[PDB]
Design goal:
This is part of a larger assembly, with two copies of chain A.
Chain A (H helix, E strand, L loop, with lengths): L11 E3 L3 E3 L2 H7 L17 H4 L1
Antiparallel strand pairs in A: 1-2
């Protein structure tokens, strides 16, 4: 019979220095580190793809 | 005794279908034709240049 150790879960730092563990919850709670003013999309494809 | 003819000043088209003759007045009255979200400025040079 051998033994197992435990390694503590790491943290990922979100906006205004808010530590968390899950990326989705940290984003839904605080938000990304830097702010883009917006995203301009260039879509190339058929008409159905554009729709 | 020679004669001079006259030609009407052309109009430039601004936001929401509004025309004018001066670019500055048209911009200050109706704004640009298109809509960006922001301008991400990259600066290259000295520290005092950044200041």
């Amino acid at each position: 019979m051998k033994e197992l150790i435990y390694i503590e879960e790491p943290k990922i730092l979100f906006a205004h220095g808010q530590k968390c563990t899950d990326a989705r919850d940290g984003l839904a709670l605080f938000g990304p580190l830097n702010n883009l003013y917006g995203i301009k999309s260039g879509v190339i494809g058929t008409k159905q793809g554009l729709k």
